[PDB]
Design a protein around this ligand. Structure first.
Ligand SMILES: Clc1ccc2c(c1)sc1nncn12
Lengths: 195, 198
């Protein structure tokens, strides 16, 4: 059930597709970035077409939509990474086993591109190029995180196995989300950009 | 896509089903266990019916069956654990972030034993306040494997010049595997819980 906006993959299961500047898809993703990163130069935006990651992610989305009994479980967030991690993320997605972990030992996603644009996350390579993903994240029902969490807290210490889906720095005005399970995040676009 | 021999769960997502001695399903698990644990006695065997864990696992199996060249990707292995972990495993499966350091480490993952005798050690199946020990029987996607190393946080690459094309699991010994380590969620389905005592 590979999405409409994807382009033909000649019966293959992984492709990185460079977007055409000035077309609708590129414009939409560029505007999400330039909201907080207008001072950075975009070199390119690639659509990540990973059939296996998409399938595993869509299964978790369907499960979370059933469990939470509504469909506002997904957010579009940013993740900055070093050039050496890009091949792994494109192929395997986000791995909590692989920077600070103040809100728990999971994968960190930013509301604002400006946060992911810090050199500590999007480490400039030899040539000065920085890399940031636009990520579909199943944030679901979230609570405030804390150091040392290995999973989100229970929604009620009466039923200790019924968990929040993610944690955040601030529930009223979140700027980051942490997820603690594989396939709760789909890397959708990779932005290559410079300071 | 739930298996047709599961009990009706009436739109519920999770059920533990107590098996009856004399049924082939109970007896094959008992035989697999007593092959190496004939000194212990089984209190009961429960089939774990977890709709969500089963779906995510079955998706990973289909992917590994596609990726690998007609391999038998799945093994039935043992996992001993403490009473305090059983409700989390029943609901959420095996979380590498919760895993103990194994006395012989082949990587930082979840460990599964070929032999019940290994899982039956008090170090893994810690006896509870009533002297009950707990062991899962687990469908594990071992796929294509190599000898692991204590440093691993994922399985190693098959080819050092293609670092993202990974082995599916690692083992203690490729000629005579006695344990397997997996490093991803939904790579193992807890199928049965054995409750046993001395
Ligand atoms: Cl504390 C923390 C750690 C990692 C991290 C953030 C915040 S925001 C962000 N964007 N990409 C990575 N990250």
């Amino acid at each position: 059930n590979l999405p409409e906006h994807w382009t033909d993959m000649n019966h293959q299961l992984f492709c990185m597709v460079q977007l055409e500047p000035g077309q609708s898809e590129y414009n939409t993703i560029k505007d999400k970035f330039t909201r907080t990163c207008s001072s950075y130069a975009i070199e390119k935006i690639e659509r990540i077409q990973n059939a296996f990651l998409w399938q595993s992610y869509q299964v978790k989305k369907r499960q979370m939509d059933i469990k939470n009994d509504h469909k506002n479980n997904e957010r579009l967030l940013f993740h900055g990474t070093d050039a050496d991690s890009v091949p792994y993320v494109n192929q395997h997605g986000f791995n909590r086993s692989c920077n600070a972990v103040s809100y728990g030992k999971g994968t960190y996603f930013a509301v604002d591109a400006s946060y992911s644009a810090k050199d500590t996350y999007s480490k400039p390579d030899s040539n000065g190029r920085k890399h940031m993903y636009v990520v579909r994240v199943l944030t679901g029902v979230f609570t405030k995180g804390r150091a040392g969490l290995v999973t989100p807290p229970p929604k009620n210490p009466h039923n200790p196995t019924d968990l929040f889906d993610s944690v955040t720095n601030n529930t009223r005005s979140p700027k980051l989300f942490v997820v603690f399970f594989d396939n709760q995040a789909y890397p959708e676009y990779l932005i290559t950009f410079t300071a």
